[PDB]
Amino acid sequence: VAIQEEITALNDELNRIAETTSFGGNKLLNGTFSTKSFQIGADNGEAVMLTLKD
Amino acid sequence: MRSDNRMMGGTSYVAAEGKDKDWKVQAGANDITFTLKDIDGNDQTITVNAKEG
């Protein structure tokens, strides 16, 4: 029971890290950062897709 | 030289299929022929044989 108490508390921490990690308000690890492209070229259509899994 | 001048822009063709991060060029469908007429009037057929994967 003692061990479980801590495991439950740590379980919460995992979820808190996921629901809080934010790059300026854009949460990163709540499954909301669906695949996004980052433009890396002077001409259009030169972007790589970055996906942040939940 | 206004911003609404037709020459200042062009035509925007958009697809309807929202391919996701997992969609990959299938080997069978690896061609997108672009049939169009140059501003001069000469006719061009651009076949872009895309690469599977």
Contact B51, B27 (CB under 8 A): no
C-alpha triplet B19, B21, A51: angle, nearest 5° = 145
For residue A49, give every residue at least 6 positions away whose Cβ sits within 8 Å of its Cβ, in sequence order, or none: A35, A36, A37, B21
Measured CA to CA, the distance from residue B43 to residue B2 in angstroms comes to 30
* Local structure of residue B18 (DSSP, 8 states): -
Find chain A residues with C-beta within 8 A of B21's C-beta: 35, 49, 51
A35 touches chain B (CB under 8 A): yes
With contacts defined as CB-CB under 8 Å, which chain A residues touch B23? none
- Phi/psi-derived region of residue A17, left when phi > 0, alpha when psi is between -120 and 50, beta in every other case: alpha
Q: Would residue A24 be called left, alpha or beta, if left means φ above 0 and alpha means ψ between -120 and 50 degrees?
A: left
Residue that the structure tokens 């006719």 belong to = B43
Candidates B21, B22, B23, B24: best to mutate against A (most CBs of A within 10 A) is B21
Distance from CA of B21 to the nearest CA of A (A): 6
CB < 8 Å to A35, chain B: 20-21
- Enumerate residues 6+ apart whose C-beta is below 8 A from B30: B49, B50, B51, B52
Please state how this structure was obtained: cryo-EM
